[PDB]
Design a protein around this ligand. Structure first.
Ligand SMILES: *[C@@H]1O[C@H](CO)[C@@H](O[C@@H]2O[C@H](CO)[C@@H](O)[C@H](O)[C@H]2NC(C)=O)[C@H](O)[C@H]1NC(C)=O
Ligand code: CA
Ligand code: CA
Length: 274
């Protein structure tokens, strides 16, 4: 296993957002041309094993552990009725105090806040990616496609990401092989070498959230200078076309930086190799 390995994301210009927004309220539009300097991106979401190395080294107590609760999806035992604040849910206990990560060491770490993610990435000699870096990386060298791999959800009849199949939120058929999370190295990589950049766990980025974007061309944009929520990208194992079509690279959502949930993790980026 090399679950902290990074890949080189090449310098380029790309179209961020879309002029065919699917969730207009989220500021998916307008499409805008963005230039990104070469940098490195983690191939994988940060796993439980990798986060444990951080905690072993630093003693870091996550925000969920200090608050004493975190959000858990009802189906696997609030923003929606299916999100419950569960006492004692945290990265080591993803569904509550009598769940464990011992059988899922290579799954993405969950119940990590934006602050927890920044602590980890900086400890590792890295940083969070910006939303633009994240989206560029997600798109994997393709232009104006829905998904990292193109426009078909199941190219060649194959599952390419861990999302929901069935009737959400009542029945997840596990058709794609995973009801909850999958190992961080599951499913094919995209054109840049990245795994589970859509689906599996949501991923924090460094940007403050806004829905107001200009069509002006930008270089290495960092998002707005202020805000209340940070941007998360990529969707999770919970997403479905019928409710929550958020497993597209252009999709975007937010949470307060001290938030945590059982479908939200992260990966790191770096200017140079650590
Ligand atoms: C985090 O630290 C724990 C505690 O030291 C590690 O677990 C121990 O590892 C030693 C050395 O391999 C084993 O002999 C013990 O059986 C383990 N003890 C316990 C309490 O589990 C753990 O391996 C470290 N985690 C990572 C990812 O490096
Ligand atoms: Ca699934
Ligand atoms: Ca993901």
């Amino acid at each position: 296993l090399a679950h902290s390995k990074m890949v080189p994301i090449p310098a380029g210009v790309f179209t961020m957002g879309t002029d065919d927004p699917q969730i207009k309220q989220d500021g998916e539009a307008p499409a805008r041309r963005v230039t990104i300097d070469a940098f490195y991106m983690d191939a994988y979401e940060v796993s439980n094993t990798e986060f444990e190395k951080f905690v072993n080294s630093t003693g870091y107590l996550t925000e969920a552990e200090k608050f004493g609760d975190s959000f858990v999806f009802e189906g696997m035992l609030a923003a929606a009725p299916w999100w419950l604040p569960v006492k004692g849910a945290n990265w080591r206990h993803p569904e509550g105090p009598d769940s464990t990560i011992l059988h899922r060491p290579d799954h993405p770490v969950l119940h990590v806040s934006w602050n927890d993610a920044v602590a980890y990435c900086t400890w590792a000699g890295k940083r969070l990616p910006t939303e633009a870096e994240w989206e560029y990386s997600c798109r994997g060298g393709l232009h104006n496609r829905l998904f990292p791999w193109g426009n078909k959800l199941q190219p060649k009849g194959q599952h390419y990401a861990n999302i929901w199949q069935g009737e959400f939120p009542v029945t997840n058929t596990g058709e794609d092989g995973f009801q909850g999370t999958a190992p961080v190295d599951a499913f094919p990589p995209n054109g840049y070498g990245l795994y589970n950049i859509v689906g599996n766990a949501w991923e924090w980025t460094s940007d403050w959230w806004t829905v107001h974007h200009s069509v002006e061309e930008t270089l290495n944009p960092k998002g707005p200078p202020s805000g209340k929520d940070r941007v998360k990208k990529g969707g999770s194992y919970m997403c479905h076309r019928s409710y929550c079509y958020r497993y597209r690279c252009a999709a975007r959502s937010q949470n307060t930086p001290d938030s945590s949930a059982s479908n939200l993790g992260f990966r790191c980026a770096a200017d140079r190799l650590p």
